[PDB]
Amino acid sequence: MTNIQTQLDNLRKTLRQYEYEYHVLDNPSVPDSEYDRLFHQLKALELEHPEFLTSDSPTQRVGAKPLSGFSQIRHEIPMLSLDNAFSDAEFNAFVKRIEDRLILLPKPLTFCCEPKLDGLAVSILYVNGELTQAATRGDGTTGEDITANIRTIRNVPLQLLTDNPPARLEVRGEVFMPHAGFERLNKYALEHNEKTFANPRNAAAGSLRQLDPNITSKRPLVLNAYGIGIAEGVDLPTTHYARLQWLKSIGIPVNPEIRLCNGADEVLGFYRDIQNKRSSLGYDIDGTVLKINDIALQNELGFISKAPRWAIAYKFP
Template sequence: MSQADPHVIDEVARLRAELDDANYRYYVLDEPRLTDADYDRRLRRLQQLEEAHPELVTADSPTQRVGAAPDAGFPEVQHAVPMLSLDNAFNEEEIKAFVRRVADRLETHGDPLAFCCEPKLDGAAVSLVYERGELVTGVTRGDGRTGEGITSNLRTLRSIPLSLRGDAPPDLLEVRGEVIMSHEGFEALNDRARESDGKVFANPRNAAAGSLRQLDPKITATRPLEFSAYQVARIEPQPGDASHSQLMARLGDLGFRTSRELTVVEGAEGVIDYCRELGEKRDALGYDIDGVVIKVDDLRLQRELGFVARAPRWAIAFKFPAQEETTRLNDVEFQVGRTGAITPVARLEPVSVAGVTVSNATLHNADEIARLDVMIGDTVAVRRAGDVIPQVVRVLEERRPADARAIVFPEHCPACGSQIEHLEGEVVARCSGGLYCPAQRKEALKHFASRRALDIDGLGEKLIEALVERDWVTTPADLFRLEAERLAELPRMGRKSSENLVAALEKARQTTLGRFIFALGIREVGEATAANLARHFGSLEALMGADIEALEAVEDVGPIVAAHVHTFFRQPHNRETIDDLLACGLTWEEQEVGERPQPLAGQSWVLTGTLASMTRDEGKARLQALGAKVAGSVSRKTACVVAGEAAGSKREKADQMGVEVIDEDEFLRRLARWEAGEDDHG
């Protein structure tokens, strides 16, 4: 056998050093530098080189062991049975080759072998030891032979039984499994971290591993962790179970959670069909998996097949395409959403992630850019899971080039030039040109025409989209310039529908100031707030000229809403659109401030259930116009409760307290009298 080329020796040494460093960062520091795909590529290359040059194989090569040594922060615990890793298959041909190897070694030439298949969970592997039915030890995987004792932390997981169920638990039981975090739990954890300026995790696996290694078990207890068992390492006395799947069912009886996706199949085709089906529903599982674990189901055959240095011969892991990859961030563009949200979008060097070519990824907002400390030119890790928009999850700072540039957030909307709002306490920046901004056009028009705004009958979502896509309508004022003859050219319109729409637009010209303010679509200004603004200022001119202090004096208007209203009316584009609407003939009856009688002044009312004749906001606005305060809960100070359909606990509480309760019909009768100026309450 010829001696290896010096270049091969150097490459082997480099790959070992990179993999050893990656293992240490992954298993010990919980700060991975390599994505799974990067790690797998390096490991496979090293395996190829060592297979071609067996003289280069050493006992400490990453191909011959599992992970890295444990951190000194927790006590070291020796595994009685090593926690070995699995060999990998990356395509269907490699699955077939595994099944052939197993069959050849067992010399089976008859019925196809049975294999137990289940998802390969992407979390943190742990081992649990029970003596006489009680949990005594919980240990991390560590390097496969020595792990970290984290029993106190694992006891906080509700999915781990502290005592085994059943009347006759085994004298000794060692269970292996994975601690994971669901997508829902992960998002909630990161949301809380962002609110408190805490650590935000890149993915659920990191979150699970980091949560397990907290020195204070009380912190671990607050994390949404789940344990799923996948193997029995030791059990005494030996049970009569003949298969791995039977052992998993026994674990379920003892109180453990096992995979609902666990299935026994026959032969290579059965395994491949399972892998395909699980791959198709991978995104809908609610938790991360990175492949399928395939095991010979018969325990006797497992013992006959035995082990190689680092893995069992009777099992293999089929790896799905990686959900995280590294690439270069070439530039950042700022997109305007349909509600005006300004989102920074990373333009990336195209890279395949989870089987899809990704060239764009969201950076969320300015706070996230600061947290990541990301710059243009950086090498970044990009994650894509299911239908989630690809996102940049971390920066490889050691690969930052000298010419990297900071990302600068714009001050004006890239779509319309209006001022961008950065309000205190809000992470999302927004364009303030709601009526004018082309990016928000369809949503603005839908809101403008909605029943609670101008109530333009016949102007639905599809028709608005058709008008905008043809550039017939760019601002709300353009609606009032539409002609029946032209509208009849649209698909499914016709002459009659066109004439009806023009008539509805004519009718909408006469409205109320409150409806008009609501139709403008000012952020966080609902029907009730719009009605309060109209009643307080009396005219549009007075409202448009109000300063922040004057706006905050309006009922139910706080600093944030006041800032939205003030900024909206300061944008020239918005004022031009309003002037255009008035020029199209939109009018309303104005009244002197305080002119309207307020027979309910000082009273507190509560609305509950569903009203058939109006929305809750409409009812609230009409009560407030009569002087009432509308509360969200019933108290002894409540004057009256209006109970609609499906009224619940609020009605019951009112009955208990002796508070007057009226139905919708009586509510409408009283509103009619009060709004007509009749002051009686009967």
């Protein structure tokens, strides 16, 4: 035991906890100045005792060197996109289809309802609680390695906030740029004779395809987790909403507008409520993602790859 090792450990724990309160709970227990005091105390002590510097320390989010190019990552589990609907009647047709298709239709049929964030879909792998890799969705089978860029995102923990993390956990979510950060970015870019972005989605896409993580760090990106891919060494909750509450409880940011709704009519009320809040959210949304909450029912229903909306195979019983 040394006093330096203990001070480093204590500072790291305290800082990760403050990052959780600020970023995930939106309820910081200390002012930003106090967080920064401890942050640059940690940074200086590590630099004076580099034998104790860890790769997942709060001070190590930015790789000091730009990359040459992005490597490709093949997802172990396919990463899905979403089919869409443009009206209440079309949404009702989607529900009616599920109701007939299910072996046993529960009473009620519960949906996890989420805002549809207009950003870039990503996969972030935690091995024994440590962030080891991150990839873009790509085509759903293969994506690009954006690990270094994802590490710069302030609300993405470099380590899970739990003493018993799973052996492996893949978090899936959307990276997006809120309105305030987007407005600042364009003001700065116009002042410094640099290129402006047309909308926050383009700004987030561009920021994540940047090869220098020093540049990504200056871009105000945020993650909101919406699902789980790989999960080894953990009994994941059996409902989608509980899985999200679980990710939040171990350090992962989740959108606070998510709600449970029973049946199509309550779901359409959620859709209208979010449609009315659009103006007040502070980030861009495209619509709502409506998900069957029960995981066993998701597994039964399954997914479809490269299928026309203009044809169907009516199978014989």
